[PDB]
Amino acid sequence: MEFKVIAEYFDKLEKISSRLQLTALLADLLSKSDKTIIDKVVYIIQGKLWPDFLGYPELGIGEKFLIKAISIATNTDENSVENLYKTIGDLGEVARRLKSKQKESLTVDEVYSTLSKVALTTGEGSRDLKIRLLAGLLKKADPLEAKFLVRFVEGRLRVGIGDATVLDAMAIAFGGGQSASEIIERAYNLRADLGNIAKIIVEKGIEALKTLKPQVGIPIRPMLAERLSNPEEILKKMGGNAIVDYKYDGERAQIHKKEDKIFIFSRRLENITSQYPDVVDYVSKYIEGKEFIIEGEIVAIDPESGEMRPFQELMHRKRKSDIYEAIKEYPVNVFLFDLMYYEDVDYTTKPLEARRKLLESIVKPNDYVKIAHHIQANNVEDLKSFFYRAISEGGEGVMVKAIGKDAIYQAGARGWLWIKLKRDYQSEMADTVDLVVVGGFYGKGKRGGKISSLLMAAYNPKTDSFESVCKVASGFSDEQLDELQKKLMEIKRDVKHPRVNSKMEPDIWVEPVYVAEIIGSEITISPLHTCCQDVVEKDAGLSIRFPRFIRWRDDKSPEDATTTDEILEMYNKQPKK
């Protein structure tokens, strides 16, 4: 197979505007290709030598060096090449012009092997080798081949075609038509290696793709998530049942292990293994299994408090020159959340509960690699509570995932099996306040011995009083709930504090000291509460509907609390319906 056919493709590509004609062009090019080297053609036509996930050096050379190569190939001095470059603005076209100004034609095979060499050659003699290699290529090239070889090496073939475009053309060229698209797409989603897929289609035919399974070392296209902002709508989609994961702000890492070698692919399926030798170490140390494909979030972590840091800190990490310095300054944890392959067995067809069960069992307990924080929600209030805990930890929100036999791993697809519930739930709980704890309530039943409900108040600066706005029981983690008893008992008072104004009687009154961030859906008129007493409705104050504890505000004194005036303001903003 001659390289001219590809140069001709590139030239035609520039002149066409029709999506139809593109498909036809590519299908033709692929079907008239040497079947033996289809796996190279599929990347060449996009301007590449190989898929990104391999982590191989990108093809490139300094421009001065390209000019040297063209100069050598065309037997024109570098100055003249330089001067033509100014007026033309593309070294490819310069190369073309200088070639057409003056017997075996280039094969795709030699172009590929030569360009691979140019990409992979490193160290001291590499400048001169790259130049010689390119010059020899450009020499053998016809004018048009030279133009597109230059562009290719420069990364200035502006093809604007991706794997999807080529998969489509492969359907047309080899699969018998558009009907082949689905089988070809499904295979690529399981094994996102265009060359691997083309090879199979060409050698064994299309039908061989139907039984295709993942191959450890080749990324699976990440399963994507739908999105909804209504927790009730989400759980209905789920059959009223779901696994709910914390949605982490980090790098979504697909982690492969084959016999001993560990690969890490980013959200974009770039090879990021070398950025995370610490993650490589955690995986090899703490994950049992010969070979596997799993997925987790790499999250930057605070070196002293271990708390999560935003994704931008991982970008800062990437910019550090010293990897050990980078790791020490920007440690990471891994929050694993799926498993798609384990010891020669494809898990993508197995239900999420089964993949998770396996995933959990293979991780030895440790401080670094953990299963995503999750629950099984069997009702919308489980989901909401968990969503609210997730964002109280500053989080994006949660990912809600179907369970059962339909809950398979849908490689590359966005559908209803995973749905993200994000902070954009800024429609329901539309109001966030800092309120003062002025009392507590014992819970009921077996926790009738523990305070599990707080009487909260807003600050009235005119009267220097705390006016009750709500009784909050939801939002407290088990740990926060347990801490309440001591926290409040320490400041228990036998009679209502004279600065606290409440008609509602808690089980214990408390010194007005502690401030909590509270969220609710809206502010409502309440006869039970004294906040803005009588201002909107007589014999009633204002209250917070469906309050949830978010967090303590240690950084606030009780007089820094949300004021009654602010409560009124928020209420007065609410639709008057």
Contacting residues for 388 by C-beta, under 8 A, at least 6 apart: 474, 475, 519, 548, 550
For residue 468, the cross-strand partners are 457
Q: Which residue carries 């400041």 as its tokens?
A: 491
- CB atoms under 10 Å from CB of 214, counted, come to 21
Q: How many Cβ atoms sit within 10 Å of the Cβ of residue 473?
A: 15
The tokens for 98 are 């200088």
Please report, for residues 538, 570, 571, the alpha-carbon distance to residue 566 in angstroms, rounded to integers and kept in the order given: 19, 6, 9
Nearest alpha-carbon partner for 399 in 380, 408, 386: 386
Rounded-to-integer distance, Cα 387 and Cα 66, Å:
55
Q: How far apart are CA 93 and CA 84, in angstroms?
A: 9
Going by C-alpha positions, the residue among 559, 575, 564 that lies closest to residue 469 is 564
Indicate if 247 belongs to the active site.
yes
Q: Which amino acids are annotated as binding site, given as ranges? A: 245, 252, 267, 297, 337, 414, 420
Binding residues for ATP: 245, 252, 267, 297, 337, 414, 420
Q: 81-93 burial, b for 16+ CB within 10 Å, e for fewer?
A: beebbeeeeebbb
How far is the C-alpha of 520 from the C-alpha of 474, rounded, in Å?
A: 11
C-alpha angle 318/321/322, rounded to 5°? 105
The residue type of 62 is G
Dihedral sign of CA atoms 324, 325, 328, 329 in order: negative
Nearest alpha-carbon partner for 570 in 532, 522, 525, 527: 522
Residues 6+ apart with CB under 8 A from 359: 294, 336, 337, 338, 339, 371
Cα gap 418→399, rounded to integer Å:
7
Entry resolution (Å): 2.0
Structural domains of the chain sorted by starting position, each given as residue range(s) with its CATH number in brackets? 1-218 (1.10.3260.10), 219-424 (3.30.470.30), 425-577 (2.40.50.140)
- Cβ neighbours, 10 Å, residue 125: 10
Residues 6+ apart with CB under 8 A from 444: none
At which residue do the structure tokens 């990440």 appear?
Answer: 222
Q: How far apart, in whole angstroms, are the C-alpha atoms of residue 197 and residue 110? A: 23
- Main-chain dihedrals φ then ψ at residue 322, nearest 5 degrees: -95, 110
- Round to whole Å and give the CA distance between 15 and 6: 15
- Say how far apart CA 346 and CA 208 lie, in whole Å: 17
DSSP string of 251-312, one letter each residue: EEEEEEEETTEEEEE-TT--B-GGG-HHHHHHHHHHB--SSEEEEEEEEEB-TTT--B--TH
Residue 36, both tokens: 């033996």
C-alpha dist (Å) from residue 46 to 20, 120, 241: 17, 19, 44
Best CA proximity match to 52, nearest among 260, 218, 198: 218
C-alpha distances (whole Å) from 370 to each of 271, 291, 310, 355, 426 are 22, 18, 18, 15, 30
Tell the residue number behind the tokens 């974009």, with chain if given. Answer: 268
165: left (phi over 0), alpha (psi -120 to 50) or beta: alpha
Q: Which amino acid is at 331?
A: P
Going by C-alpha positions, the residue among 515, 519, 247, 553 that lies closest to residue 394 is 247
Residue burial 443-462, b: 16+ Cβ < 10 Å; e: rest: beeeeeeebbbbbbbbbbee
Q: Which of 464, 451, 450, 476 is nearest to 512 (CA)?
A: 464
Q: Which of 68, 247, 350, 422 is catalytic?
A: 247
